Amino acid sequence: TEDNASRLEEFSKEWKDASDKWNA
Amino acid sequence: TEDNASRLEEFSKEWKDASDKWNA
């Protein structure tokens, strides 16, 4: 559970960056 | 926890393909 949470929180920043790229 | 990890690892491949489309 902790590994899954950590890896997906890491992916969350990347996908937030992708969303920011989409906004521009 | 295992169901969540499995489903999000499945989503990870789809979002990696989405990032590949982002690059192209």
UniProtKB/Swiss-Prot annotation, chains A, B:
Coiled coil: none annotated. It is found in: Virion; Host cytoplasm. It comes from the Viruses. Belongs to the Caudoviricetes tip attachment protein J family. Interacts with host LamB. Attaches the virion to the host receptor LamB, inducing viral DNA ejection. During tail assembly, initiates distal tail tip assembly by interacting with gpI, gpL and gpK. During virus entry to host cell, binds strongly to host LamB in an irreversible attachment. The binding induces structural changes in the tail leading to viral DNA injection through LamB trimeric pore. This is Tip attachment protein J.
